[PDB]
Design an enzyme around this catalytic site. Sequence first.
Site, PDB file in Angstrom:
ATOM      1  N   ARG A  79       0.708  -1.155  -0.110  1.00 11.63           N
ATOM      2  CA  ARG A  79       0.002  -0.056  -0.100  1.00 11.63           C
ATOM      3  C   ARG A  79       0.930   1.465  -0.179  1.00 11.63           C
ATOM      4  O   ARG A  79       0.450   2.379  -0.430  1.00 11.63           O
ATOM      5  CB  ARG A  79      -0.635   0.196   1.328  1.00 11.63           C
ATOM      6  CG  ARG A  79      -2.008  -0.722   1.793  1.00 11.63           C
ATOM      7  CD  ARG A  79      -2.355   0.108   3.204  1.00 11.63           C
ATOM      8  NE  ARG A  79      -1.477   0.811   3.886  1.00 11.63           N
ATOM      9  CZ  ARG A  79      -0.417   0.460   4.424  1.00 11.63           C
ATOM     10  NH1 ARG A  79      -0.307  -1.043   4.529  1.00 11.63           N
ATOM     11  NH2 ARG A  79       0.477   1.503   4.641  1.00 11.63           N
ATOM     12  N   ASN A  80       1.881   1.363   0.358  1.00  7.10           N
ATOM     13  CA  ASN A  80       2.776   2.405   0.575  1.00  7.10           C
ATOM     14  C   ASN A  80       3.886   2.583  -0.405  1.00  7.10           C
ATOM     15  O   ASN A  80       4.865   3.222  -0.195  1.00  7.10           O
ATOM     16  CB  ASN A  80       3.104   2.607   2.183  1.00  7.10           C
ATOM     17  CG  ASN A  80       3.724   4.342   1.976  1.00  7.10           C
ATOM     18  OD1 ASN A  80       4.862   4.314   2.527  1.00  7.10           O
ATOM     19  ND2 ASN A  80       3.149   5.170   1.792  1.00  7.10           N
ATOM     20  N   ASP A  94       7.901   7.302   0.574  1.00 12.82           N
ATOM     21  CA  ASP A  94       7.711   8.815   0.957  1.00 12.82           C
ATOM     22  C   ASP A  94       6.496   9.010   1.987  1.00 12.82           C
ATOM     23  O   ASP A  94       5.527   9.475   1.495  1.00 12.82           O
ATOM     24  CB  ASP A  94       7.579   9.607  -0.346  1.00 12.82           C
ATOM     25  CG  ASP A  94       6.465  10.925   0.197  1.00 12.82           C
ATOM     26  OD1 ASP A  94       6.813  11.545   1.016  1.00 12.82           O
ATOM     27  OD2 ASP A  94       5.500  11.143  -0.660  1.00 12.82           O
TER      28      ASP A  94
END
Length: 261
Positions: free
Chosen positions: A135-136, A149
């Site tokens: 997800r990131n 980030d």
Amino acid sequence: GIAREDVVLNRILGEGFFGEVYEGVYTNHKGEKINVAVKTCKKDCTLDNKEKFMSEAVIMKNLDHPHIVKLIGIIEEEPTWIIMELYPYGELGHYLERNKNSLKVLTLVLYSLQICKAMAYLESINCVHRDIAVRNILVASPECVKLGDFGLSRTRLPIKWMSPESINFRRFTTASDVWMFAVCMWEILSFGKQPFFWLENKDVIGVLEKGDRLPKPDLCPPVLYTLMTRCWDYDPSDRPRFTELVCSLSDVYQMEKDIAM
Ligand SMILES: O=C1C=c2cc(Nc3ncc(C(F)(F)F)c(NCc4ccccc4S(=O)(=O)N4CCCC4)n3)ccc2=N1
């Protein structure tokens, strides 16, 4: 730096921890149209929040690496605006639930490879990342992911992803990063599966104490799963360092373009 005139906005991307990211369009101080993602701050807690935003900001100016999100520029003022290249494919978690089939382990290990390299660079500029989760992570191209980030540094807490120390003492060193990163490797060769989906947070630590590890992933080799297993060594000091994971992961993958006829 670049100015508000230059950024057209066109839709809400999503809601960060700092609220809206917007898809929009930069236009070059010389002429050209780069498609873009613009991070702004919530309706935002007095300081605690704007601070954490400027802070992610300022680390970003310095960063530079093919596998972290590219920072195009900032507009300091009211809504300060962080501008980052757009990655039209989105979260790797989803580009993955929707490709269970298209993808060959040789791919799933290039991803993990590349994130790892992202980590090795972060180590050397002494930064950490607190959200190495799928997800990131963004896909720029099927042949290329870029880390987050957001989590970049140095509440909602990815416990499921955290080394025991990170949890007992809120210490995120590089070693707890290595643990975390392996949890992300698991994710990728699990096509986006939630680590420990069955427990909720409160009784994770227990688990790792009696000595409990995440299931081997089907598509994942023996060596590779052992290489993750070391990254979950209870004792930080037996965990491989980043450069170690690079040189060695770049093994398990040049040994993979091999088993490919
Ligand atoms: O459906 C989509 C299509 C997307 C394209 C995206 N491209 C893309 N390129 C660059 C960035 C950057 F650099 F800001 F980190 C970026 N950030 C947005 C983002 C990144 C990671 C995770 C989540 C998001 S988000 O889109 O902000 N989001 C939070 C709640 C659910 C969705 N997105 C991102 C998300 C998308 N969702």
